[PDB]
Amino acid sequence: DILISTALIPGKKAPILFNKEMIESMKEGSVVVDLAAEAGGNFETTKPGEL
Amino acid sequence: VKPGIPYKQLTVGVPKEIFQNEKRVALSPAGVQALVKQGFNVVVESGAGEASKFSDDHYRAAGAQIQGAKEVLASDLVVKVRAPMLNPTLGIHEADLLKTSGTLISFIYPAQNPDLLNKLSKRNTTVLAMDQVPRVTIAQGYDALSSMANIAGYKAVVLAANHFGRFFTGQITAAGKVPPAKILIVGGGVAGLASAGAAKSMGAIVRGFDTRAAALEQFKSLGAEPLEVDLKESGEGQGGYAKEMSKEFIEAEMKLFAQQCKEVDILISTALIPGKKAPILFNKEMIESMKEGSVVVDLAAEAGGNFETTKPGELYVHKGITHIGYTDLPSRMATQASTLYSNNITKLLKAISPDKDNFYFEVKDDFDFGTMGHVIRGTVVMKDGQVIFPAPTPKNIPQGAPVKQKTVAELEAEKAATITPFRKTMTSASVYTAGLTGILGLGIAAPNLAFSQMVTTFGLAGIVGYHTVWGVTPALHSPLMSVTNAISGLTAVGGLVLMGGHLYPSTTSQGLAALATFISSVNIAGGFLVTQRMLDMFKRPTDPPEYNYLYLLPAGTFVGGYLASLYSGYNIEQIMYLGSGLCCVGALAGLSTQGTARLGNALGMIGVAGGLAATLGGLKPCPELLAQMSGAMALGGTIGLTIAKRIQISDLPQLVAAFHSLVGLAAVLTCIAEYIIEYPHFATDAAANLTKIVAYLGTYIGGVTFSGSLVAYGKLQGILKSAPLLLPGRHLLNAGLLAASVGGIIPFMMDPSFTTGITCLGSVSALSAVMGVTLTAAIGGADMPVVITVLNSYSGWALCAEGFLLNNNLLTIVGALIGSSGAILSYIMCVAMNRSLANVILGGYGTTSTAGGKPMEISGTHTEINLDNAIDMIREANSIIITPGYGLCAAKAQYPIADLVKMLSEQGKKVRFGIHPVAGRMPGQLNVLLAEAGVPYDIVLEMDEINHDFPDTDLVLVIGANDTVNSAAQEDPNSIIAGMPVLEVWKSKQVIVMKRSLGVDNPIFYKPNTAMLLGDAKKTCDALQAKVRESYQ
């Protein structure tokens, strides 16, 4: 039910570890946390300045 | 005919939300499953759970139907989470859009909704009140205020975060110690306990306190620091509410809260006066007495708050201490809120009208306390305009008086507290002065120094025997009885020094001694066979290979050095008796480990070998006399060797009770034989009277052993009827036989006539046999094995009285060693139950803590389960404790339990067994039957260590046991079986009981967390075996 993405390689861009429909593949009410927000993010869709 | 109309004609309705910030839902899709499963029709609106993360397609596939909004509330039942108001979506009141005879179950509060009550009476609808459900135990399935309080407390402890700038738990790592926070739970109802559990899970230090005394107990039980005030007034608020005490308690609590207000940083206010405003527990300066960065949130945001400064709906800073004052905290958690609302509505409607396709819900206005009729009348507040809001009090007084029971631990504490400290020391000093004058009394009648030497070695061997058979692991008691019977065949030593003449006996005493050694070799061969057949069943397969053939080195050099010292002109037999006696002690001592058990049999075989070789070499036999001794002992070994390999281990106590009869017969025979061979030496012997008395006593003991053992064999096997048969005058008869055994010893001196002496010495075996039949027939097979161990004590003391007669140290050492083992097994099994020995032997009623009369009845209901719901309830669990009984293993039904354990343990479960010391007909029989089944001994526990490893268990399988799992034993002092220690099985959750049909019956049979099934334990068990194998594979 909860998903926290904190994956990031230092010095290069963080790999997108979540897809476009695999992110919507959770239930309606999912929580996707992207803790690599300054270095891009581990999702296929993540605006890094707003929830 | 029932007047309830069909539920298929009944239509429930879920309308949209018209109130501002109304985000929770009343019915889920899982909430749409039931009550359409119970029968009512369901029509749903378009937007109901989009904010609650519940799509309308899920309710459409769950059974609800897509309808409009005007025709949604205008159904046979209309369901909202709040009262109807002026719907600005439609522009009229929501009561103006429904049908006439509707069905209303929502938040009403009609004391605050009088105009809503008038608008409902104008619509002529029937309204049940969800808010007016009183605090009842049967209404515990539907407590909407309690679940709303729990959800609001969890959301409040959640909203504590993102307001506090420090970590909640705090750790001491290697960068700086993070101090934990101090949270103040001001006001503990249900939400106080819920938020306290959420904070204690989070890691904070909670110090909540409340005016209610039960709230302080619950706060300490959750683990908070219960703060106290100085003005200890009476705790107001009887009846499930909170009232106002004096102003002294208010000022003391205000001072205490202001003092701790400088100590804590989190302020959670959850106190509320019922029907009145919130009591002001935080003033301006009393709130300003906190540090900066603090947070004060109040759960009573609707009816004001306990803070003097509170903005209802905001997040105001207000000079640093941010008063978190949002008013809809639980509305923001609409998923679990709607889930609990649907669960409460289902638990209400399950008792509101319990009929399939029929619904009347006729309320009773008789006002019976505890009744669901009075709870329904309090719930149903309007009936087509007829207001039932002002309700009358209940006529009964259910759940209103503290008459709780007092346990039998308290009564035994009282019977220990009725003894002044003078009488404890007085009784102890009386026992010691009786013992010391008994030692002097044995000193006065001593004829020579040989008897003093034998008394000294007898007493010291008795203390070794007392001290070494408490040492054994209680899983190995069932080999211990067989080891002591194998050692008990050393009365052949009593035969061999008497056996004489030629290869055929000359005199009659030589014939009797030949009979004694012949029926005593049987004990040795059969006992060591059943011992090593039994110890080779506790062996796990994944152990290293134990080589045992290299124990012929100590035995070989032991008897080889003895025979070399025999052919060297030496004499070692007085030291060989020490060697065999210490090997017989090490037989019982070395088996106290479960890992070195095989040495504990090898030392016994060395001991018996060295003992018989020493006594045989210590009388110089001529080479034709030795052939008869070898032939007689070899025939006895042949018989005992060929019978103890053709019996299954379930038939063991018959064999052990036969071996004790043989030991008693051998002792009587060698006693009479030694009296007959030593008659013409009754002039020149100072110890002649002493050996005459010791002959009499050994005759008495052996005869009682013989008769009681063969009657015990008859009652165990099934030959005699297992019921405790009666004799009309027994106590005068048993007292008469005992007094005749005492009175026979008086004419047994004063006449050295052989014709009188032998005829009054052989008339003692008869009296012993008659009293043994009289004291063994009237026992009862349920408390059987205490009389199979008391006979073991009698055989050991028969060997002790033999050793005092033949002047032999080996016999006295092993006699004390066997007798103390028998008495300790009888004591550990009399204290397994709680009956004393004198209440067992000469008849008695009940336990030793019951008193008076009237064993109490306990009511309750049943819960039947099939095989499929049994395996459905097993298949989840991860920690299972099985308590098998004797009706399991003696019904040839332990092999499916064995491979059930074998199949469940390899899938990640934790299967353990739990064993009680009277489950069986021998001490420790159930351990060896479970090891016969093929179970490793790392999962078989005993009672004293599994008993507090029940509450963290998912599942308990109770299989064929009644008295060891009763609940009347601990709580009910009237009961028959009270005070008996017992497995606390009713601190688990799901208890499968397998027995024949039905039931003083056990209260676990009616306690509602028990999920029992039916059938024969073989059939239920192996059907469950086949389902376990066909379910997973």
From Swiss-Prot, chain B:
Biological classification of the source: Eukaryota, Metazoa, Chordata, Craniata, Vertebrata
Residues noted as binding NADP(+) in the record, renumbered to the chain: 886, 918-923, 960-964, 979-980, 995-999, 1016-1017
EC number: 7.1.1.1
Top-level taxon: Eukaryota
Gene3D superfamilies given in the database record: NAD(P)-binding Rossmann-like Domain, TPP-binding domain
Subunit architecture: Homodimer.
Membrane topology listed for this record: Multi-pass membrane protein
Family: In the N-terminal section; belongs to the AlaDH/PNT family.
Species in which this protein is naturally found: Ovis aries (Sheep)
Topological domain ranges for the Mitochondrial matrix compartment: 1-427, 532-548, 833-1033
Keywords: Acetylation, Membrane, Mitochondrion, Mitochondrion inner membrane, NAD, NADP, Transit peptide, Translocase, Transmembrane, Transmembrane helix
SUPFAM superfamilies: DHS-like NAD/FAD-binding domain, Formate/glycerate dehydrogenase catalytic domain-like, NAD(P)-binding Rossmann-fold domains
Reactions listed under catalytic activity: NAD(+) + NADPH + H(+)(in) = NADH + NADP(+) + H(+)(out)
Name of this chain's protein: NAD(P) transhydrogenase, mitochondrial
